[PDB]
Design a protein around this ligand. Structure first.
Ligand code: FES
Length: 105
Protein backbone atom coordinates (compact mmCIF):
# COMPACT_ATOMS: atom_id res chain seq x y z
CA UNK A 1 0.00 0.00 0.00
CA UNK A 2 0.72 3.65 0.45
CA UNK A 3 1.35 5.36 3.75
CA UNK A 4 1.94 8.56 5.64
CA UNK A 5 3.77 8.90 8.90
CA UNK A 6 4.16 11.92 11.14
CA UNK A 7 6.39 13.14 13.96
CA UNK A 8 7.52 16.08 16.07
CA UNK A 9 10.83 16.40 14.20
CA UNK A 10 9.55 16.70 10.64
CA UNK A 11 5.81 16.90 11.28
CA UNK A 12 5.30 14.36 8.52
CA UNK A 13 6.78 11.24 7.01
CA UNK A 14 4.82 10.25 3.90
CA UNK A 15 5.58 6.70 2.88
CA UNK A 16 4.14 3.41 1.82
CA UNK A 17 3.95 -0.08 3.04
CA UNK A 18 3.17 -3.64 2.01
CA UNK A 19 0.54 -5.99 3.40
CA UNK A 20 2.43 -7.58 6.24
CA UNK A 21 4.43 -4.54 7.30
CA UNK A 22 3.77 -2.38 10.34
CA UNK A 23 3.73 1.43 10.61
CA UNK A 24 6.82 1.18 12.80
CA UNK A 25 8.95 -0.58 10.20
CA UNK A 26 8.00 1.63 7.30
CA UNK A 27 9.45 4.46 9.29
CA UNK A 28 13.01 3.21 9.31
CA UNK A 29 12.38 2.56 5.63
CA UNK A 30 11.02 6.09 5.18
CA UNK A 31 13.97 7.54 7.09
CA UNK A 32 11.46 8.36 9.82
CA UNK A 33 12.82 9.19 13.28
CA UNK A 34 12.25 5.51 13.96
CA UNK A 35 12.16 6.52 17.60
CA UNK A 36 11.78 2.98 18.93
CA UNK A 37 14.31 0.17 18.38
CA UNK A 38 13.08 -1.42 21.60
CA UNK A 39 12.11 -5.08 21.14
CA UNK A 40 11.80 -5.02 17.36
CA UNK A 41 8.33 -6.52 17.47
CA UNK A 42 9.43 -9.34 19.76
CA UNK A 43 6.44 -8.32 21.87
CA UNK A 44 8.47 -7.80 25.04
CA UNK A 45 8.25 -4.02 25.36
CA UNK A 46 5.47 -1.43 25.59
CA UNK A 47 7.15 1.89 24.83
CA UNK A 48 6.38 1.93 21.10
CA UNK A 49 3.43 4.23 21.75
CA UNK A 50 2.76 5.08 18.10
CA UNK A 51 -0.43 6.71 16.82
CA UNK A 52 -2.33 5.98 13.62
CA UNK A 53 -3.93 9.03 12.04
CA UNK A 54 -7.54 9.46 13.28
CA UNK A 55 -8.79 8.21 9.92
CA UNK A 56 -7.27 4.75 9.96
CA UNK A 57 -7.85 3.71 13.49
CA UNK A 58 -11.17 2.40 12.35
CA UNK A 59 -9.21 1.00 9.40
CA UNK A 60 -6.32 -0.38 11.34
CA UNK A 61 -8.12 -1.47 14.47
CA UNK A 62 -6.19 -0.56 17.59
CA UNK A 63 -5.05 -3.30 19.93
CA UNK A 64 -7.57 -5.32 21.87
CA UNK A 65 -8.32 -4.54 25.52
CA UNK A 66 -5.39 -6.82 26.42
CA UNK A 67 -2.42 -4.87 25.05
CA UNK A 68 -4.28 -1.60 25.61
CA UNK A 69 -5.08 -2.44 29.24
CA UNK A 70 -1.57 -3.32 30.40
CA UNK A 71 -0.44 0.01 28.93
CA UNK A 72 -3.38 1.86 30.49
CA UNK A 73 -2.48 0.36 33.87
CA UNK A 74 0.05 3.17 34.25
CA UNK A 75 -2.61 5.87 34.20
CA UNK A 76 -1.46 8.01 31.28
CA UNK A 77 -3.88 9.71 28.84
CA UNK A 78 -4.45 8.30 25.36
CA UNK A 79 -6.20 9.32 22.14
CA UNK A 80 -8.07 7.45 19.41
CA UNK A 81 -5.62 5.31 17.48
CA UNK A 82 -2.96 4.80 20.14
CA UNK A 83 -1.72 1.21 19.79
CA UNK A 84 1.52 -0.75 19.45
CA UNK A 85 2.19 0.08 15.80
CA UNK A 86 5.04 -2.44 15.72
CA UNK A 87 2.32 -5.00 16.40
CA UNK A 88 0.22 -3.76 13.49
CA UNK A 89 0.49 -4.82 9.86
CA UNK A 90 -0.55 -3.70 6.42
CA UNK A 91 -3.33 -5.42 4.49
CA UNK A 92 -5.56 -4.40 1.51
CA UNK A 93 -7.67 -2.87 4.29
CA UNK A 94 -5.18 -0.28 5.48
CA UNK A 95 -3.66 0.82 2.22
CA UNK A 96 -2.49 4.40 2.08
CA UNK A 97 -2.30 4.51 5.86
CA UNK A 98 -1.47 7.64 7.81
CA UNK A 99 0.57 7.34 10.96
CA UNK A 100 1.40 9.76 13.78
CA UNK A 101 3.73 10.18 16.76
CA UNK A 102 2.63 11.34 20.24
CA UNK A 103 4.35 13.88 22.50
CA UNK A 104 7.31 13.25 24.85
CA UNK A 105 5.97 10.17 26.63
S1 FES B 1 8.56 -2.22 19.81
FE1 FES B 1 8.36 -3.54 21.56
S2 FES B 1 6.21 -4.00 21.70
FE2 FES B 1 6.40 -2.57 20.04
Amino acid sequence: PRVVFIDEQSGEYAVDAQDGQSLMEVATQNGVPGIVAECGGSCVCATCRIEIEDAWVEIVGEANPDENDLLQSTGEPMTAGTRLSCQVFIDPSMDGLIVRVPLPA
